[PDB]
Design a protein around this ligand. Structure first.
Ligand SMILES: [Zn+2]
Ligand SMILES: [Zn+2]
Length: 72
């Protein structure tokens, strides 16, 4: 029971997109006021300085302390 897989990049569902919704809109990707959460700690990013990972999003806390590849 789905309409379309184009809208919020979180709940695999379309966004209201009617005329002034409290949703998150990015350069290309998008999310909801709730769905919009880190990809490591799933923390509330709505209204914050979230980051942009390769193919995912993250929060300043995580992005700042990203384990990264095999390094020190
Ligand atoms: Zn959503
Ligand atoms: Zn995080």
């Amino acid at each position: 029971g789905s309409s379309g897989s184009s809208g919020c990049a979180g709940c695999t569902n379309p966004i209201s997109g009617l005329g002034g919704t409290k949703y998150i809109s990015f350069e290309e990707r998008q999310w909801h006021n709730d769905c919009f959460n880190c990809k490591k700690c799933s923390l509330s990013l709505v209204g914050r300085g979230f980051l942009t990972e390769r193919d995912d999003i993250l929060c300043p806390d995580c992005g700042k302390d990203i384990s990264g590849p095999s390094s020190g």
